[PDB]
Amino acid sequence: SRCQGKSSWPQLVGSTGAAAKAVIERENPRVRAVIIKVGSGATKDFRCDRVRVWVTERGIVARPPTIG
Numbered sequence: 001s002r003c004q005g006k007s008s009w010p011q012l013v014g015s016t017g018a019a020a021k022a023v024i025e026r027e028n029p030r031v032r033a034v035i036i037k038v039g040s041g042a043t044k045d046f047r048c049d050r051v052r053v054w055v056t057e058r059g060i061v062a063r064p065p066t067i068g
């Protein structure tokens with residue numbers, strides 16, 4: 001019965017990746033946030049325990065973090 005809880009963090013765009021990771025992982029204890037640079041690619045599968053945090057070259061969140 002996975003994927004419950006908060007599952008998207010639209011207000012974290014524009015935040016730093018580190019700030020975002022901590023907010024995500026505090027608000028939903030069933031996920032781990034993964035910082036990844038925009039354009040670098042990540043597996044195209046679906047996981048309820050993962051939140052990709054897509055960041056610019058300066059480490060700013062550039063897409064709304066969502067479970068998947």
Ligand SMILES: [K+]
Nearest residue numbers: 011012013014
């Ligand atoms: K914001």
Ligand code: NA
Nearest residue numbers: 009010011012
């Ligand atoms: Na949010």
Ligand code: NA
Nearest residue numbers: 051052067068
């Ligand atoms: Na994700």
